[PDB]
Design a protein around this ligand. Structure first.
Ligand SMILES: N[C@@H](CCC(=O)O)C(=O)O
Ligand SMILES: N[C@@H](CCC(=O)O)C(=O)O
Ligand SMILES: N[C@@H](CCC(=O)O)C(=O)O
Ligand SMILES: N[C@@H](CCC(=O)O)C(=O)O
Ligand SMILES: N[C@@H](CCC(=O)O)C(=O)O
Ligand SMILES: N[C@@H](CCC(=O)O)C(=O)O
Ligand SMILES: N[C@@H](CCC(=O)O)C(=O)O
Ligand SMILES: N[C@@H](CCC(=O)O)C(=O)O
Ligand SMILES: [Mg+2]
Ligand SMILES: [Mg+2]
Ligand SMILES: [Mg+2]
Ligand SMILES: [Mg+2]
Lengths: 252, 252
């Protein structure tokens, strides 16, 4: 499988997940239907999105790591799949939720070759491959803001901060793309518990890096050894290379 | 003018503003075109939204208080208008931005008779009149959550808080409606500077109250005497009756 295959597969998944979610009324979406392998409830919306995505991925030689059903398959290409990132928004009809896919040539983030995030409510498509990062077919890149007085997505502000704006939209995959395309100057997830899972973050991280972003753990450490399994957890500090070290200093 | 008139006028305005914004590419939207009477830049998106709204409002016997052009007209019905609440989102193609209208029989919030917030990106329509609060023609009411461990919209978290989720979408008018319909359990704007202006908040406040919400200033004081002018500023604490006093204690 190469990056062109992955783009084709991701688009087919986006089309099916979008159709499955769009037809589901909110009351239906909101219902709990089971306990996910991640340890949080699976909503009906999560289940139909995942079934639609897995029906396509099952035909490929992959090992899938996905929120509700866990680790499936034995293939050599690993796929971190979030079939519905921003479930809370989706169940409320708040239009910021996405299907997220990151393809890697091993079970580690450093071997990623493709990242894809599709906003299921707006139809915005973000992806990245060896040729760069894209939003709806157009090349994107992170902003060049150098000052802490900037536009930040941050989980969570717990002290007085110097940002021009702080936002929290409820969908890390999409928000990492908001950072990738320069809509926001940085993305931080500095929650002490380390809450992000590999499938929440992997595609956005890859897309943001291809867009020129520096993206690391809390202390500036590489994300390369983050594993595609259910146990993996991440904090994230993401910004252009000039702003990034100022952020690291700020959160100390 | 009564609440039936206000609904008709608001829908006509929503239709025109929506069409004006939808046809405007993001690069165009993001351009500064002037200094607003509120003291912040008017974006091209703000100007076309306002021109479209004012063209309809000029035919009514109203005094309009609006962000970009300030106080206009001499009519006895006061209208707090935000042509485009969530301009930052609109210029980035983030689908949470609205036109907001609150009609009052005096220049004070306590005399409001109609509130209307229309999401310009999704077409969601919220309004409230003497018959209650509505989302897309269906009656709504605030949630019944009693615990601080709840889903909160908050400007801004600056300390450790006990919430289940914290969100900040960048559109107070819309977010107050997210609270009105029970999507979130509370809405707080506790920024020390007191940043909200009357046209940002008035419609969402009115809609949230008609939906059963208790909505007050920072110390529990009534919002009834808030003025429809450019100088007015607001902090907001909004929740159902049971949760509201716990929030007041929490932020002390
Ligand atoms: N296949 C998806 C999206 C693909 C694309 O963004 O071109 C759809 O038709 O909804
Ligand atoms: N995304 C919202 C509606 C907004 C839209 O699709 O334009 C929903 O949950 O359906
Ligand atoms: N805007 C998407 C559809 C999104 C949805 O229906 O939820 C498209 O072009 O197909
Ligand atoms: N003109 C706006 C843009 C906001 C921004 O890009 O941070 C301002 O700077 O207030
Ligand atoms: N605001 C009206 C119609 C406006 C429009 O369709 O653009 C409504 O939602 O019923
Ligand atoms: N809000 C995005 C698109 C979202 C949607 O179409 O639902 C925009 O400004 O155009
Ligand atoms: N979907 C909305 C339009 C949203 C937009 O044009 O931004 C409607 O019913 O007209
Ligand atoms: N089952 C979800 C629902 C979200 C909510 O109501 O806060 C949870 O408790 O996490
Ligand atoms: Mg789950
Ligand atoms: Mg998910
Ligand atoms: Mg302005
Ligand atoms: Mg405005």
């Amino acid at each position: 499988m190469d990056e062109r295959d992955a783009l084709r597969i991701s688009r087919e998944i986006a089309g099916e997940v979008r159709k499955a979610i769009a037809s589901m009324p909110l009351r239906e979406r909101v219902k709990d239907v089971g306990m996910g392998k991640d340890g949080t409830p699976t909503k009906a919306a999560d289940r139909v999105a995942e079934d639609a995505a897995l029906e396509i991925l099952r035909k490929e030689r992959v090992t899938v790591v996905t929120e509700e059903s866990g680790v499936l398959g034995e293939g050599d290409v690993f796929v971190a799949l979030d079939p519905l990132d921003g479930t809370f928004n989706a169940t409320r009809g708040i239009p910021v939720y996405s299907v997220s896919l990151c393809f890697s040539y091993s079970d580690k983030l450093k071997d990623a070759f493709f990242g894809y995030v599709y906003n299921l409510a707006t139809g915005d498509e973000y992806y990245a491959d060896s040729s760069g990062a894209y939003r709806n077919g157009e090349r994107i890149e992170v902003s060049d803001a150098e000052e802490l007085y900037c536009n930040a997505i941050i989980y969570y502000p717990d002290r007085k901060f110097p940002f021009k704006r702080m936002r929290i939209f409820g969908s890390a995959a999409t928000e990492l793309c908001f950072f990738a395309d320069g809509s926001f100057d940085c993305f931080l997830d500095i929650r002490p518990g380390k809450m992000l899972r590999i499938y929440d973050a992997a595609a956005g991280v890859f897309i943001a890096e291809k867009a020129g972003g520096k993206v690391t753990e809390l202390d500036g450490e590489s994300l390369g050894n983050k594993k595609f399994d259910m146990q993996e957890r991440l904090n994230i500090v993401a910004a252009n290379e000039k702003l990034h070290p100022k952020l690291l200093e700020l959160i100390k």
